[PDB]
Design an enzyme around this catalytic site. Structure first.
Site, short mmCIF file in Angstrom:
data_model
loop_
_atom_site.label_atom_id
_atom_site.label_comp_id
_atom_site.label_asym_id
_atom_site.label_seq_id
_atom_site.Cartn_x
_atom_site.Cartn_y
_atom_site.Cartn_z
N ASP A 1 39.40 44.27 47.36
CA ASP A 1 39.02 43.30 46.33
C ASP A 1 37.93 42.37 46.86
OD1 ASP A 1 40.97 41.94 48.05
OD2 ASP A 1 41.18 40.39 46.48
N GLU B 1 38.99 37.50 51.11
CA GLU B 1 39.05 37.07 49.72
C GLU B 1 38.47 35.66 49.54
OE1 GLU B 1 42.41 34.95 47.88
OE2 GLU B 1 42.92 36.99 47.17
#
Length: 338
Positions: free
Chosen positions: A94, A33
């Site tokens: 993500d 991330e």
């Protein structure tokens, strides 16, 4: 022609070798991330040197040299006193999605076919390893390549596919075409009180599991749902429907003057005060001039220090958008501010 908050983020949080370091973990971790967000901010900033630095660290240390063949490991850091290495080989979708989108947009905007090639390969690998057809739903994006799918139950993270990125990815055909529709429905259907959950389960033959539960909360992941929605282009026909569904989060923030830390998804009951990052994350989301200004004051007076990776990246997204550091087109392309 610089973005000062990003300049400072590079100095305070990114190593010379190009890894984003969360200083608040004794293991001094890097996450996929953190890397993906650094790629996005570097592209927004027209900062190709840092983009390449971050990308090369990511490929060599998280993806065995090739994200097209290996999804980035999500967690890297100090394992022993004598061994800095991958701490968890699982993926986080993500981050995979933000890396792929950032690679595709850098290839387009910097006219560099190698970014495009790597992004296309990564996107196909995401589709192969962490997109699955769920009975009753169709194709869905799993939060990671292992550990979120069983025979009768699946667990999803509504913050993991920003609607504008989903809209963008439809240009590559299936499964992204259908994933955009199932993602839109996921966001609408799992926020029964207007608050999106961090994590939500779907059970075979039963549907969404939305009964009151201590783990069904709008918290440190779901805050980004409101952020993504707020940063959609107004001319995306679906932004309005998402703002309408999630409007209770805006009304609750405005009433309190403080973004709640957690909201019970099933009952709408709030508890705690969110950090400054939550204030920044709602700047693009809040449509009311005054409620927005209250949060803007909080971000200005309590800007995150060097010991707060999470509030800092949320602030780069939310305050950055609030300062027109980047925009998204109606198709989810970057509209750069260069």
């Amino acid at each position: 022609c610089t973005w000062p908050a990003w300049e400072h983020f590079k100095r305070a949080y990114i190593s010379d070798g190009g890894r984003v370091i969360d200083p608040s973990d004794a293991r001094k971790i890097t996450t996929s991330e953190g890397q993906s967000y650094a790629l996005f901010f570097a592209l927004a900033a027209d900062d190709r040197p840092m983009f390449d630095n971050v990308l090369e660290w990511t490929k060599d240390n998280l993806a065995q040299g090739d994200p097209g063949e290996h999804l980035p490991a999500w967690l890297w850091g100090k394992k022993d006193e004598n061994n800095w290495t991958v701490l968890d080989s699982n993926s986080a979708s993500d981050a995979d999605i933000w890396i792929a989108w950032s690679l595709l947009e850098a290839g387009r905007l910097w006219k560099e076919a190698r970014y495009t090639t790597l992004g296309n390969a990564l996107l196909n690998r995401i589709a192969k390893e962490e997109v699955v057809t769920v009975p009753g739903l169709g194709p869905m994006l799993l939060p990671g390549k292992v550990g979120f799918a069983e025979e009768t139950v699946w667990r999803l993270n509504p913050s993991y596919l920003p609607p504008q990125i989903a809209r963008y990815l439809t240009r590559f055909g299936e499964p992204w075409t259908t994933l955009q529709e199932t993602n839109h429905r996921l966001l609408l259907e799992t926020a029964p009180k207007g608050f999106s959950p961090d994590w939500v389960r779907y059970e075979k033959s039963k549907g969404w599991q939305l009964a009151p539960d201590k783990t069904l909360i709008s918290g440190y992941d779901a805050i980004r749902v409101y952020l993504w929605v707020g940063m959609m282009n107004d001319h995306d026909a679906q932004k309005a429907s998402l703002l309408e569904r999630l409007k209770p989060m805006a009304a609750l923030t405005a009433k309190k003057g403080v973004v709640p830390e957690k909201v019970d998804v099933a009952t709408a009951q709030p508890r705690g005060d969110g950090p400054v990052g939550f204030a920044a994350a709602l700047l693009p989301f809040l449509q009311d001039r005054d409620a927005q200004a209250v949060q803007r004051q909080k971000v200005a007076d309590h800007f995150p220090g060097d010991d707060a990776y999470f509030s800092y990246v949320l602030t780069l997204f939310g305050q950055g958008w609030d300062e027109h550091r980047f925009r998204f087109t109606p198709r989810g392309e970057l509209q750069p501010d260069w």
